[PDB]
Amino acid sequence: MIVLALDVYEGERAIKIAKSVKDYISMIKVNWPLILGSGVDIIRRLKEETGVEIIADLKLADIPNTNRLIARKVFGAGADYVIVHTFVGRDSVMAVKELGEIIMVVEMSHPGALEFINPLTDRFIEVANEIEPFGVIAPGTRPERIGYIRDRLKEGIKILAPGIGAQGGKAKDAVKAGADYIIVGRAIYNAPNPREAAKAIYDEIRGV
Amino acid sequence: MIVLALDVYEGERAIKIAKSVKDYISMIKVNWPLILGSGVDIIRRLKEETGVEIIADLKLADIPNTNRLIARKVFGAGADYVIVHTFVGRDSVMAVKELGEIIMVVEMSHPGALEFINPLTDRFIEVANEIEPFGVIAPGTRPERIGYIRDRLKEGIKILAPGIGAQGGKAKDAVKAGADYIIVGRAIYNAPNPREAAKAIYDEIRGV
């Protein structure tokens, strides 16, 4: 249920951390900065070193043909899931889904999201319901939002949520509210002992 | 002025095509396919082999800090412009603009664009007018749209138009309608003789 946001750009350093917490996470999420610095082969390297599935957080948002060229290369490189925007249209989402498992963005948490993205979350969820992606991604800052989305999201589509909070009990609360996966980064990779931290989040979630 | 959308994976193929059409183009636009297949250093290599400016068409659509990390890396690798989506918000756009010149997506050509992007074009043109990027991307499929945008867009902001009439003298009409640059990808990189293909378009735009 835990997804490690491996936002560590010293390549071998990132790999060491990922290997150390491998037993307590379900997936590793890599972004464009890591792929740019280490190359797209960082995805196969992480898989070989950890045995964990990889989410390529690409936010694809181009026309169908281009989204297709990108997805073919990234899935070919071993990515298990690709994160794609919903706002570019159904055809652009489908061009990626036809090549591999996808996770659709339906809401974001930065101030700018209030301008165009978030006013459309309800509609993006309805679109996701028709597309049937592996899951959707939305902020987990407020467990009430997770539930709101879960109520509207077709059963079977998973919810992945970043930003649930580092306080004791936040991880367990986000899962109970409807998150299938919680995405955690700094609380793990910047801990004095990343494995211990990941293990503690794991324990909180599988506990009571 | 033609912008070559070099959407191929292989670096040697990309460099060979770019050098062969260099005399007939103004800039080379690199997207994720080429960065993924050849590494981000292909930006620098393309510049060293042709001497023209490079646009990084990344369709940036992330939160400010992630957009910043990507922009810093790509501009630092030699990109002269970075293409960003207006949809994700002003803050995400400025995170990139503070590091280098940008081009904003205000409208797209694929059918999916009619679902969310195009309905907001008037609003996006007004956001671009406030930000004052180097230019905006508007599809040239119909010179009607180029002129529609040109009338509403602040004078100093350039218009780059992809999806140009794969038919007859459409590039010329697009330019006449207000396009400063014509983005051509497939028509050139998939052509039997890319240099002859580029020259034809070049001659059309330059004629009367």
Coordinates of all heavy atoms in Angstrom, one line a residue, chain A residues 9 31-33 35-37 40 57-66 68-70 72-74 85-92 108-113 115-117 120 123-124 127, chain B residues 7-9 31-33 35-37 40 57-64 66 69-70 73-74 85-92 108-113 115-117 120 123-124 127 186 189:
Chain A
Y9 N 18.0 12.7 -6.3 CA 18.6 12.7 -7.6 C 20.1 12.3 -7.8 O 20.6 12.4 -8.9 CB 18.4 14.2 -8.1 CG 16.9 14.5 -8.0 CD1 16.5 15.6 -7.2 CD2 15.9 13.7 -8.5 CE1 15.1 15.8 -7.0 CE2 14.6 13.9 -8.3 CZ 14.1 15.0 -7.5 OH 12.8 15.2 -7.3
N31 N 10.2 10.5 -10.9 CA 9.7 11.7 -11.7 C 10.6 12.0 -12.9 O 11.6 11.4 -13.1 CB 9.5 12.9 -10.8 CG 10.8 13.3 -10.0 OD1 11.9 12.9 -10.4 ND2 10.6 14.1 -9.0
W32 N 10.3 13.1 -13.6 CA 11.1 13.5 -14.7 C 12.5 13.9 -14.2 O 13.5 13.6 -14.9 CB 10.5 14.6 -15.5 CG 9.4 14.2 -16.5 CD1 8.1 14.7 -16.6 CD2 9.6 13.3 -17.6 NE1 7.5 14.1 -17.7 CE2 8.4 13.3 -18.3 CE3 10.6 12.5 -18.0 CZ2 8.2 12.5 -19.5 CZ3 10.4 11.7 -19.2 CH2 9.2 11.7 -19.9
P33 N 12.6 14.6 -13.1 CA 14.0 15.0 -12.7 C 14.9 13.8 -12.5 O 16.1 13.8 -13.0 CB 13.7 15.7 -11.4 CG 12.5 16.5 -11.7 CD 11.6 15.5 -12.4
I35 N 14.6 10.7 -14.0 CA 14.8 10.2 -15.3 C 15.8 11.0 -16.2 O 16.6 10.5 -16.9 CB 13.4 10.0 -16.1 CG1 12.6 8.9 -15.4 CG2 13.7 9.7 -17.6 CD1 11.1 9.0 -15.8
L36 N 15.7 12.3 -16.0 CA 16.6 13.2 -16.7 C 18.0 13.1 -16.2 O 19.0 13.1 -17.0 CB 16.2 14.7 -16.5 CG 15.0 15.1 -17.4 CD1 14.4 16.4 -16.9 CD2 15.4 15.2 -18.8
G37 N 18.2 12.9 -14.9 CA 19.6 12.8 -14.4 C 20.2 11.4 -14.5 O 21.4 11.3 -14.8
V40 N 16.5 7.0 -18.6 CA 15.3 6.1 -18.5 C 15.7 4.7 -18.0 O 14.8 3.9 -17.5 CB 14.5 6.1 -19.8 CG1 15.3 5.4 -20.9 CG2 13.2 5.4 -19.6
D57 N 6.0 8.8 -13.0 CA 5.2 10.0 -12.8 C 5.6 11.0 -13.9 O 6.4 11.9 -13.6 CB 5.4 10.6 -11.4 CG 4.6 11.8 -11.1 OD1 3.7 12.1 -11.9 OD2 4.7 12.4 -10.0
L58 N 5.0 10.9 -15.0 CA 5.3 11.7 -16.2 C 4.3 12.9 -16.5 O 4.6 13.8 -17.2 CB 5.4 10.9 -17.4 CG 6.3 9.6 -17.3 CD1 6.4 9.0 -18.7 CD2 7.7 10.1 -16.8
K59 N 3.1 12.8 -15.9 CA 2.1 13.8 -16.2 C 1.9 14.0 -17.7 O 1.9 15.2 -18.2 CB 2.6 15.2 -15.6 CG 2.8 15.2 -14.0 CD 1.5 15.1 -13.2 CE 1.7 15.3 -11.7 NZ 2.9 14.5 -11.1
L60 N 1.9 12.9 -18.5 CA 1.7 13.1 -19.9 C 0.6 14.0 -20.3 O -0.5 13.8 -19.8 CB 1.6 11.7 -20.6 CG 2.8 10.8 -20.5 CD1 2.6 9.6 -21.4 CD2 4.1 11.5 -20.9
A61 N 0.8 14.9 -21.2 CA -0.2 15.9 -21.6 C 0.1 16.4 -23.0 O 0.1 17.6 -23.2 CB -0.2 17.0 -20.6
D62 N 0.3 15.5 -23.9 CA 0.5 15.8 -25.3 C -0.6 15.2 -26.2 O -1.5 14.6 -25.7 CB 1.9 15.4 -25.7 CG 2.6 16.4 -26.7 OD1 1.9 16.7 -27.8 OD2 3.7 16.8 -26.5
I63 N -0.5 15.4 -27.5 CA -1.5 14.9 -28.4 C -1.3 13.4 -28.4 O -0.3 12.8 -28.0 CB -1.3 15.4 -29.9 CG1 0.1 15.0 -30.4 CG2 -1.4 17.0 -29.9 CD1 0.4 15.3 -31.9
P64 N -2.3 12.6 -28.9 CA -2.2 11.2 -28.9 C -0.9 10.6 -29.5 O -0.3 9.8 -28.8 CB -3.5 10.7 -29.7 CG -4.5 11.7 -29.3 CD -3.7 13.0 -29.4
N65 N -0.6 10.9 -30.7 CA 0.7 10.3 -31.3 C 1.9 10.5 -30.5 O 2.7 9.6 -30.4 CB 0.9 10.8 -32.7 CG 2.1 10.1 -33.4 OD1 2.0 8.9 -33.6 ND2 3.2 10.8 -33.7
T66 N 2.1 11.7 -29.9 CA 3.3 12.0 -29.1 C 3.2 11.2 -27.7 O 4.2 10.7 -27.3 CB 3.4 13.5 -28.8 OG1 3.6 14.1 -30.1 CG2 4.7 13.7 -28.0
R68 N 1.8 8.6 -27.3 CA 2.0 7.2 -27.7 C 3.5 6.9 -27.8 O 4.0 5.9 -27.3 CB 1.3 6.8 -29.0 CG 1.2 5.3 -29.3 CD 0.5 5.0 -30.5 NE -0.9 5.5 -30.4 CZ -1.5 6.5 -31.1 NH1 -0.7 7.2 -31.9 NH2 -2.7 6.8 -30.9
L69 N 4.3 7.8 -28.5 CA 5.7 7.6 -28.6 C 6.4 7.6 -27.3 O 7.4 6.8 -27.1 CB 6.3 8.8 -29.4 CG 6.2 8.8 -30.9 CD1 6.9 10.1 -31.4 CD2 6.8 7.5 -31.5
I70 N 6.0 8.4 -26.3 CA 6.6 8.4 -25.0 C 6.3 7.2 -24.2 O 7.1 6.6 -23.6 CB 6.0 9.6 -24.2 CG1 6.4 10.9 -24.9 CG2 6.6 9.6 -22.8 CD1 5.6 12.1 -24.4
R72 N 5.3 4.3 -25.2 CA 5.9 3.0 -25.8 C 7.3 2.9 -25.3 O 7.8 1.8 -24.9 CB 5.9 3.1 -27.3 CG 6.4 1.8 -27.9 CD 6.4 1.9 -29.5 NE 5.1 2.2 -30.1 CZ 4.8 3.4 -30.6 NH1 5.7 4.4 -30.5 NH2 3.6 3.6 -31.1
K73 N 8.0 4.0 -25.2 CA 9.4 3.9 -24.7 C 9.5 3.7 -23.2 O 10.4 2.9 -22.8 CB 10.1 5.3 -25.1 CG 11.5 5.4 -24.6 CD 12.5 4.5 -25.3 CE 13.8 4.5 -24.6 NZ 14.9 3.7 -25.3
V74 N 8.7 4.3 -22.4 CA 8.7 4.2 -21.0 C 8.2 2.8 -20.5 O 8.8 2.2 -19.6 CB 8.0 5.3 -20.3 CG1 8.0 5.1 -18.8 CG2 8.8 6.6 -20.6
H85 N -2.2 13.1 -17.4 CA -3.2 14.1 -17.1 C -4.5 13.7 -17.8 O -4.5 13.0 -18.8 CB -2.7 15.5 -17.6 CG -2.1 16.3 -16.6 ND1 -2.7 16.6 -15.4 CD2 -0.8 16.8 -16.5 CE1 -1.8 17.3 -14.6 NE2 -0.7 17.4 -15.3
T86 N -5.6 14.1 -17.3 CA -6.9 13.9 -17.8 C -7.3 15.1 -18.7 O -8.0 15.0 -19.7 CB -8.0 13.8 -16.7 OG1 -7.6 12.8 -15.7 CG2 -9.4 13.4 -17.2
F87 N -6.8 16.3 -18.3 CA -7.2 17.5 -19.1 C -6.9 17.6 -20.6 O -7.6 18.3 -21.3 CB -6.7 18.7 -18.3 CG -5.3 19.0 -18.6 CD1 -4.9 19.7 -19.7 CD2 -4.3 18.8 -17.6 CE1 -3.5 20.1 -19.9 CE2 -3.0 19.2 -17.7 CZ -2.6 19.9 -18.9
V88 N -6.0 16.8 -21.1 CA -5.7 16.8 -22.5 C -6.7 16.1 -23.4 O -6.6 16.1 -24.6 CB -4.2 16.4 -22.7 CG1 -3.9 16.3 -24.2 CG2 -3.3 17.4 -22.1
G89 N -7.6 15.4 -22.7 CA -8.6 14.7 -23.5 C -8.6 13.2 -23.4 O -7.6 12.6 -23.1
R90 N -9.7 12.5 -23.7 CA -9.8 11.1 -23.7 C -8.9 10.4 -24.7 O -8.4 9.3 -24.4 CB -11.3 10.6 -23.9 CG -11.3 9.1 -23.8 CD -12.7 8.5 -24.2 NE -12.6 7.0 -24.2 CZ -13.4 6.2 -24.8 NH1 -14.4 6.6 -25.5 NH2 -13.1 4.9 -24.7
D91 N -8.8 10.9 -25.9 CA -7.9 10.3 -26.9 C -6.5 10.2 -26.4 O -5.8 9.2 -26.6 CB -8.1 10.9 -28.3 CG -7.9 12.4 -28.3 OD1 -7.7 13.0 -27.2 OD2 -8.0 13.0 -29.4
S92 N -6.0 11.3 -25.8 CA -4.6 11.3 -25.4 C -4.4 10.3 -24.2 O -3.3 9.8 -24.0 CB -4.2 12.7 -25.0 OG -4.2 13.6 -26.1
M108 N -5.0 18.4 -8.0 CA -3.6 18.7 -7.6 C -3.6 19.5 -6.3 O -4.6 20.1 -6.0 CB -2.8 19.3 -8.7 CG -2.7 18.4 -9.9 SD -1.9 19.1 -11.3 CE -0.1 19.0 -10.8
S109 N -2.5 19.6 -5.6 CA -2.5 20.4 -4.4 C -1.8 21.7 -4.3 O -1.8 22.3 -3.2 CB -2.0 19.5 -3.2 OG -0.7 19.1 -3.5
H110 N -1.2 22.2 -5.4 CA -0.5 23.5 -5.3 C -1.5 24.6 -5.5 O -2.7 24.4 -6.0 CB 0.5 23.5 -6.4 CG -0.1 23.3 -7.8 ND1 -0.8 22.2 -8.2 CD2 -0.1 24.1 -8.9 CE1 -1.2 22.3 -9.4 NE2 -0.8 23.5 -9.9
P111 N -1.2 25.8 -5.1 CA -2.1 26.9 -5.3 C -2.7 27.1 -6.7 O -3.9 27.4 -6.9 CB -1.3 28.1 -4.8 CG -0.4 27.6 -3.8 CD 0.1 26.3 -4.5
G112 N -1.8 26.9 -7.7 CA -2.3 27.0 -9.1 C -3.4 26.0 -9.5 O -4.1 26.2 -10.5
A113 N -3.5 24.9 -8.8 CA -4.5 23.9 -9.1 C -5.9 24.5 -9.0 O -6.9 24.1 -9.6 CB -4.4 22.7 -8.3
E115 N -7.0 27.2 -10.0 CA -7.4 27.9 -11.2 C -8.1 27.2 -12.3 O -9.1 27.7 -12.8 CB -6.1 28.6 -11.8 CG -5.7 29.8 -10.9 CD -4.2 30.2 -11.1 OE1 -3.7 30.0 -12.2 OE2 -3.6 30.7 -10.2
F116 N -7.7 26.0 -12.7 CA -8.4 25.2 -13.8 C -8.6 23.8 -13.5 O -9.6 23.2 -13.9 CB -7.6 25.4 -15.1 CG -7.3 26.8 -15.5 CD1 -6.1 27.4 -15.3 CD2 -8.4 27.6 -15.9 CE1 -5.9 28.7 -15.6 CE2 -8.2 28.9 -16.2 CZ -6.9 29.5 -16.1
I117 N -7.6 23.2 -12.9 CA -7.6 21.7 -12.6 C -8.7 21.3 -11.6 O -9.6 20.6 -11.9 CB -6.3 21.2 -12.1 CG1 -5.2 21.3 -13.1 CG2 -6.4 19.8 -11.5 CD1 -5.2 20.2 -14.2
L120 N -12.4 21.2 -12.0 CA -12.8 20.1 -12.9 C -12.7 18.7 -12.4 O -12.9 17.7 -13.1 CB -12.0 20.2 -14.3 CG -12.4 21.3 -15.3 CD1 -11.4 21.4 -16.4 CD2 -13.8 21.0 -15.9
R123 N -15.7 16.4 -12.9 CA -15.7 15.9 -14.3 C -14.6 14.9 -14.6 O -14.8 14.0 -15.4 CB -15.8 17.1 -15.3 CG -17.2 17.7 -15.3 CD -17.1 19.0 -16.1 NE -16.7 18.9 -17.5 CZ -16.5 19.9 -18.3 NH1 -16.7 21.1 -17.9 NH2 -16.1 19.6 -19.5
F124 N -13.4 15.2 -14.1 CA -12.3 14.3 -14.4 C -12.6 12.9 -13.8 O -12.2 11.9 -14.4 CB -10.9 14.8 -13.8 CG -10.4 16.0 -14.5 CD1 -9.6 16.9 -13.8 CD2 -10.7 16.3 -15.8 CE1 -9.1 18.0 -14.4 CE2 -10.2 17.5 -16.4 CZ -9.4 18.3 -15.7
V127 N -14.8 11.1 -16.1 CA -14.1 10.6 -17.3 C -13.3 9.4 -16.9 O -13.3 8.4 -17.7 CB -13.1 11.7 -17.8 CG1 -12.1 11.2 -18.8 CG2 -14.0 12.8 -18.4
Chain B
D7 N 10.7 14.4 -33.4 CA 10.2 13.4 -32.6 C 10.6 12.0 -33.0 O 9.8 11.2 -33.5 CB 8.7 13.5 -32.4 CG 8.3 14.9 -31.9 OD1 9.1 15.4 -31.0 OD2 7.3 15.4 -32.3
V8 N 11.9 11.6 -32.8 CA 12.4 10.3 -33.1 C 13.2 9.9 -31.8 O 13.5 10.8 -31.0 CB 13.4 10.3 -34.3 CG1 12.7 10.8 -35.6 CG2 14.6 11.2 -34.0
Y9 N 13.5 8.7 -31.7 CA 14.2 8.2 -30.5 C 15.7 8.2 -30.5 O 16.4 8.6 -29.5 CB 13.8 6.7 -30.2 CG 12.4 6.4 -29.9 CD1 11.7 5.4 -30.5 CD2 11.7 7.1 -28.9 CE1 10.4 5.1 -30.2 CE2 10.4 6.8 -28.6 CZ 9.8 5.8 -29.2 OH 8.5 5.5 -28.9
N31 N 11.3 16.9 -27.8 CA 10.2 16.5 -26.9 C 10.8 15.3 -26.1 O 11.9 14.8 -26.3 CB 9.0 16.1 -27.7 CG 7.7 16.2 -26.9 OD1 7.6 15.8 -25.8 ND2 6.6 16.8 -27.5
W32 N 9.9 14.7 -25.2 CA 10.4 13.6 -24.4 C 10.8 12.3 -25.2 O 11.7 11.6 -24.7 CB 9.3 13.2 -23.4 CG 8.9 14.3 -22.4 CD1 7.8 15.0 -22.3 CD2 9.8 14.8 -21.3 NE1 7.8 15.8 -21.2 CE2 9.1 15.8 -20.6 CE3 11.1 14.5 -20.9 CZ2 9.6 16.5 -19.5 CZ3 11.6 15.2 -19.8 CH2 10.9 16.2 -19.2
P33 N 10.3 12.1 -26.4 CA 10.8 10.9 -27.1 C 12.3 10.9 -27.3 O 13.0 9.9 -27.1 CB 10.0 10.9 -28.4 CG 8.7 11.5 -28.0 CD 9.1 12.7 -27.1
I35 N 14.6 12.9 -25.8 CA 15.3 13.0 -24.6 C 15.4 11.6 -24.0 O 16.5 11.2 -23.4 CB 14.7 14.0 -23.6 CG1 14.9 15.4 -24.1 CG2 15.3 13.8 -22.2 CD1 14.1 16.5 -23.5
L36 N 14.3 10.8 -24.0 CA 14.3 9.5 -23.5 C 15.2 8.5 -24.2 O 16.0 7.7 -23.6 CB 12.9 8.9 -23.5 CG 11.9 9.3 -22.4 CD1 10.5 8.9 -22.9 CD2 12.2 8.6 -21.1
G37 N 15.2 8.6 -25.6 CA 16.0 7.7 -26.4 C 17.5 8.0 -26.4 O 18.3 7.1 -26.6
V40 N 19.2 13.7 -22.1 CA 19.0 15.1 -22.2 C 20.1 15.9 -22.9 O 20.0 17.0 -23.3 CB 18.7 15.7 -20.8 CG1 19.9 15.6 -20.0 CG2 18.2 17.1 -21.0
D57 N 10.1 20.9 -25.9 CA 8.6 20.8 -25.8 C 8.3 19.7 -24.8 O 8.2 18.5 -25.1 CB 8.0 20.4 -27.2 CG 6.5 20.5 -27.2 OD1 5.8 20.6 -26.1 OD2 6.0 20.4 -28.3
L58 N 8.2 20.1 -23.5 CA 8.0 19.2 -22.4 C 6.6 19.2 -21.9 O 6.2 18.3 -21.1 CB 8.9 19.6 -21.3 CG 10.4 19.7 -21.7 CD1 11.2 20.1 -20.5 CD2 10.9 18.3 -22.3
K59 N 5.7 20.1 -22.4 CA 4.3 20.2 -21.9 C 4.3 20.1 -20.4 O 3.5 19.4 -19.8 CB 3.5 19.0 -22.5 CG 3.4 18.9 -24.0 CD 2.7 20.1 -24.6 CE 2.3 19.8 -26.1 NZ 3.4 19.4 -26.9
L60 N 5.2 20.9 -19.8 CA 5.3 20.9 -18.3 C 3.9 21.2 -17.7 O 3.2 22.2 -18.0 CB 6.3 21.9 -17.8 CG 7.8 21.6 -18.2 CD1 8.7 22.5 -17.4 CD2 8.1 20.1 -18.0
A61 N 3.5 20.3 -16.8 CA 2.2 20.3 -16.1 C 2.3 19.8 -14.7 O 1.4 19.0 -14.3 CB 1.2 19.5 -17.0
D62 N 3.3 20.2 -13.9 CA 3.4 19.7 -12.6 C 3.3 20.9 -11.6 O 3.1 22.0 -12.0 CB 4.7 19.0 -12.4 CG 4.6 17.7 -11.5 OD1 4.3 17.9 -10.3 OD2 4.9 16.6 -12.0
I63 N 3.5 20.6 -10.3 CA 3.5 21.6 -9.3 C 4.7 22.5 -9.5 O 5.7 22.0 -10.1 CB 3.5 21.0 -7.9 CG1 4.8 20.3 -7.6 CG2 2.3 20.1 -7.7 CD1 4.9 19.6 -6.2
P64 N 4.7 23.7 -9.0 CA 5.9 24.6 -9.1 C 7.3 24.0 -8.8 O 8.2 24.1 -9.6 CB 5.5 25.8 -8.2 CG 4.0 25.9 -8.3 CD 3.6 24.4 -8.3
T66 N 8.4 20.9 -8.9 CA 8.8 19.9 -9.8 C 9.1 20.5 -11.2 O 10.1 20.2 -11.8 CB 7.7 18.7 -9.9 OG1 7.7 18.1 -8.6 CG2 8.1 17.7 -10.9
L69 N 12.5 22.1 -11.0 CA 13.6 21.1 -11.1 C 13.8 20.7 -12.5 O 14.9 20.6 -13.0 CB 13.3 19.9 -10.2 CG 13.4 20.0 -8.7 CD1 13.1 18.7 -8.0 CD2 14.8 20.5 -8.3
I70 N 12.7 20.4 -13.3 CA 12.8 20.0 -14.7 C 13.3 21.2 -15.5 O 14.2 21.0 -16.3 CB 11.4 19.6 -15.2 CG1 10.9 18.3 -14.5 CG2 11.5 19.3 -16.7 CD1 9.4 18.0 -14.6
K73 N 17.0 21.8 -15.0 CA 17.8 20.7 -15.7 C 17.9 20.9 -17.2 O 19.0 20.8 -17.8 CB 17.3 19.3 -15.3 CG 18.0 18.2 -16.1 CD 19.4 18.0 -15.5 CE 20.0 16.7 -16.0 NZ 21.4 16.4 -15.3
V74 N 16.7 21.1 -17.8 CA 16.7 21.3 -19.2 C 17.3 22.6 -19.8 O 18.0 22.5 -20.8 CB 15.2 21.1 -19.7 CG1 15.1 21.3 -21.2 CG2 14.8 19.6 -19.4
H85 N 2.3 24.0 -20.1 CA 0.8 24.1 -20.2 C 0.3 25.3 -19.3 O 0.9 25.5 -18.3 CB 0.2 22.8 -19.7 CG -0.1 21.8 -20.8 ND1 -1.0 22.1 -21.8 CD2 0.4 20.6 -21.0 CE1 -1.1 21.0 -22.6 NE2 -0.2 20.1 -22.1
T86 N -0.7 25.9 -19.8 CA -1.3 27.0 -19.0 C -2.2 26.5 -18.0 O -2.4 27.0 -16.9 CB -2.1 28.0 -19.9 OG1 -1.2 28.5 -21.0 CG2 -2.5 29.2 -19.1
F87 N -2.8 25.3 -18.3 CA -3.8 24.6 -17.5 C -3.5 24.3 -16.0 O -4.4 24.4 -15.2 CB -4.1 23.3 -18.2 CG -5.6 22.9 -18.1 CD1 -6.3 22.7 -19.2 CD2 -6.2 22.7 -16.9 CE1 -7.7 22.4 -19.2 CE2 -7.5 22.3 -16.8 CZ -8.3 22.2 -17.9
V88 N -2.2 24.1 -15.7 CA -1.9 23.7 -14.3 C -1.7 25.0 -13.4 O -1.5 24.8 -12.2 CB -0.6 22.9 -14.3 CG1 -0.1 22.6 -12.9 CG2 -1.0 21.5 -15.0
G89 N -1.9 26.2 -14.0 CA -1.8 27.3 -13.1 C -0.7 28.3 -13.3 O 0.4 27.9 -13.8
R90 N -0.9 29.5 -12.9 CA 0.1 30.5 -13.0 C 1.4 30.3 -12.3 O 2.5 30.5 -12.8 CB -0.4 31.9 -12.6 CG 0.6 33.0 -12.8 CD 0.1 34.4 -12.4 NE 1.1 35.4 -12.6 CZ 1.1 36.6 -12.1 NH1 0.2 37.0 -11.3 NH2 2.2 37.4 -12.4
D91 N 1.3 29.8 -11.0 CA 2.5 29.5 -10.3 C 3.4 28.5 -10.9 O 4.6 28.6 -10.9 CB 2.2 29.1 -8.8 CG 1.2 27.9 -8.7 OD1 0.7 27.4 -9.7 OD2 0.9 27.5 -7.6
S92 N 2.8 27.4 -11.5 CA 3.6 26.4 -12.2 C 4.3 27.0 -13.5 O 5.4 26.6 -13.8 CB 2.8 25.2 -12.6 OG 2.4 24.6 -11.4
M108 N -5.1 23.3 -28.5 CA -4.5 22.2 -29.1 C -5.3 21.7 -30.3 O -6.5 22.0 -30.4 CB -4.2 21.0 -28.1 CG -3.1 21.4 -27.1 SD -2.7 20.2 -25.9 CE -1.5 19.2 -26.9
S109 N -4.7 20.8 -31.1 CA -5.4 20.4 -32.4 C -6.0 19.0 -32.4 O -6.8 18.7 -33.3 CB -4.3 20.4 -33.5 OG -3.2 19.5 -33.2
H110 N -5.7 18.1 -31.4 CA -6.4 16.8 -31.4 C -7.8 16.9 -31.0 O -8.2 17.8 -30.3 CB -5.5 15.9 -30.5 CG -5.4 16.3 -29.1 ND1 -4.8 17.5 -28.7 CD2 -5.9 15.8 -28.0 CE1 -4.9 17.7 -27.4 NE2 -5.5 16.6 -26.9
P111 N -8.6 15.8 -31.3 CA -10.0 15.9 -30.9 C -10.2 16.0 -29.4 O -11.2 16.6 -28.9 CB -10.6 14.6 -31.5 CG -9.4 13.8 -31.9 CD -8.4 14.8 -32.3
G112 N -9.3 15.4 -28.6 CA -9.4 15.5 -27.1 C -9.4 16.9 -26.6 O -9.9 17.2 -25.5
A113 N -8.7 17.8 -27.4 CA -8.6 19.2 -27.0 C -9.9 19.9 -26.8 O -10.0 20.8 -26.0 CB -7.7 19.9 -28.0
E115 N -12.4 18.8 -25.3 CA -13.1 18.5 -24.1 C -12.8 19.5 -22.9 O -13.8 19.9 -22.3 CB -12.8 17.1 -23.7 CG -13.2 16.1 -24.7 CD -12.5 14.7 -24.6 OE1 -11.9 14.5 -23.5 OE2 -12.5 13.9 -25.5
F116 N -11.6 19.9 -22.8 CA -11.2 20.8 -21.7 C -10.4 22.0 -22.0 O -10.6 23.1 -21.6 CB -10.5 20.1 -20.5 CG -11.3 18.9 -20.0 CD1 -11.0 17.6 -20.3 CD2 -12.5 19.1 -19.2 CE1 -11.7 16.5 -19.8 CE2 -13.2 18.1 -18.7 CZ -12.8 16.8 -19.0
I117 N -9.3 21.7 -22.9 CA -8.4 22.8 -23.2 C -9.0 23.9 -24.1 O -8.9 25.1 -23.6 CB -7.2 22.2 -24.0 CG1 -6.4 21.2 -23.1 CG2 -6.3 23.3 -24.5 CD1 -5.3 20.6 -23.7
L120 N -11.2 26.8 -22.8 CA -10.6 27.8 -21.9 C -9.6 28.6 -22.7 O -8.9 29.4 -22.1 CB -9.8 27.1 -20.8 CG -10.7 26.5 -19.7 CD1 -9.9 25.6 -18.7 CD2 -11.4 27.6 -18.9
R123 N -9.6 32.3 -21.9 CA -9.0 32.6 -20.6 C -7.5 32.4 -20.7 O -6.8 33.2 -20.1 CB -9.7 31.6 -19.6 CG -9.2 31.8 -18.2 CD -9.6 33.2 -17.6 NE -9.0 33.4 -16.3 CZ -8.1 34.4 -16.0 NH1 -7.7 35.2 -16.9 NH2 -7.6 34.5 -14.8
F124 N -7.0 31.4 -21.3 CA -5.6 31.1 -21.4 C -4.9 32.3 -22.2 O -3.7 32.6 -21.8 CB -5.3 29.8 -22.1 CG -5.7 28.6 -21.3 CD1 -5.9 27.4 -21.9 CD2 -5.9 28.7 -19.9 CE1 -6.2 26.2 -21.2 CE2 -6.3 27.5 -19.2 CZ -6.4 26.3 -19.9
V127 N -4.3 34.9 -19.7 CA -3.2 34.6 -18.7 C -1.9 34.8 -19.3 O -1.0 35.4 -18.7 CB -3.3 33.1 -18.2 CG1 -2.2 32.9 -17.2 CG2 -4.7 32.9 -17.6
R186 N 6.5 15.3 -38.5 CA 6.4 14.1 -39.4 C 6.6 14.4 -40.9 O 7.3 13.7 -41.6 CB 5.0 13.5 -39.2 CG 5.0 12.5 -38.1 CD 3.6 12.2 -37.7 NE 3.2 13.1 -36.6 CZ 2.2 12.9 -35.8 NH1 1.5 11.8 -35.8 NH2 1.9 13.8 -34.8
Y189 N 10.6 14.7 -40.8 CA 11.3 13.5 -40.3 C 10.9 12.2 -40.9 O 11.7 11.3 -40.8 CB 11.5 13.5 -38.8 CG 10.2 13.2 -38.0 CD1 9.6 11.9 -38.0 CD2 9.7 14.2 -37.2 CE1 8.5 11.6 -37.2 CE2 8.6 13.9 -36.3 CZ 8.0 12.6 -36.3 OH 6.9 12.4 -35.5

